[PDB]
Amino acid sequence: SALTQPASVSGSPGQSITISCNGTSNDVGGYESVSWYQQHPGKAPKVVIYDVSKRPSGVSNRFSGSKSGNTASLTISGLQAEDEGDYYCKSLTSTRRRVFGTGTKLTVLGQPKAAPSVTLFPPSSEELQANKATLVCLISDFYPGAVTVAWKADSSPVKAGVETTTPSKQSNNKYAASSYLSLTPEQWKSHKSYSCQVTHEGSTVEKTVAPT
Numbered sequence: 001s002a003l004t005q006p007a008s009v010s011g012s013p014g015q016s017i018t019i020s021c022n023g024t025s026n027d028v029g030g031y032e033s034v035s036w037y038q039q040h041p042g043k044a045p046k047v048v049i050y051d052v053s054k055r056p057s058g059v060s061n062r063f064s065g066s067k068s069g070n071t072a073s074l075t076i077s078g079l080q081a082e083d084e085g086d087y088y089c090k091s092l093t094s095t096r097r098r099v100f101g102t103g104t105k106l107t108v109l110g111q112p113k114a115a116p117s118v119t120l121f122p123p124s125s126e127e128l129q130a131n132k133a134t135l136v137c138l139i140s141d142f143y144p145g146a147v148t149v150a151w152k153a154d155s156s157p158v159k160a161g162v163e164t165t166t167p168s169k170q171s172n173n174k175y176a177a178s179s180y181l182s183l184t185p186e187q188w189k190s191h192k193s194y195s196c197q198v199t200h201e202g203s204t205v206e207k208t209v210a211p212t
């Protein structure tokens with residue numbers, strides 16, 4: 001089977017928050033081995049609570065663990081911006097197998113808008129001899145963490161060779177992403193202009209670059 005947890009939980013900056021993790025006598029109920037992880041977009045999970053209530057080193061004392069019956073609970077007090085993430089519970093069973101929580105999208109609410117700062121890179125002379133032409137559009141310091149990109153071969157828009165990373169929570173908790181328009185060196189040499197245009201909560205940001 002699987003561990004049941006709420007889908008979404010939202011909190012105001014400073015408040016305490018509780019994420020439950022419902023299980024059975026075969027996991028949460030009969031064992032002291034429930035652990036909590038946090039997913040930040042471009043990050044690998046980080047253990048905040050292990051064996052019900054134990055915090056590892058470098059994890060804030062604002063995190064606490066608990067269990068009653070078949071229900072485990074993670075308590076984040078004094079909510080801050082970095083706390084906005086995806087939370088998951090894990091438990092060791094009667095056997096060697098392990099069970100996983102459905103996950104919980106924890107949202108903080110102070111959340112000031114921050115339009116992205118766009119930086120458009122032409123392909124490097126180093127990459128050019130390598131027979132590739134990837135234009136890199138570095139979208140940074142944006143909030144909330146979502147954008148719609150749009151490339152153009154001067155004015156004529158392009159939908160081919162477009163790749164867009166998922167936003168990754170930076171150290172200041174704002175998001176940063178990257179869009180790649182992969183072209184051939186003749187393709188690049190030809191067009192007199194290229195444009196990168198992100199759209200974020202209606203407001204659009206546009207950078208331009210031209211070959212030399």
Ligand SMILES: *[C@@H]1O[C@H](CO)[C@@H](O[C@@H]2O[C@H](CO)[C@@H](O)[C@H](O)[C@H]2NC(C)=O)[C@H](O)[C@H]1NC(C)=O
Binds near residue numbers: 071
């Ligand atoms: C997890 O199971 C708990 C029981 O421990 C459920 O919590 C109860 O839910 C109802 C309505 O949904 C409330 O009015 C009660 O006060 C809760 N009871 C207790 C004893 O705390 C809960 O619905 C389950 N949820 C998930 C997401 O797994």
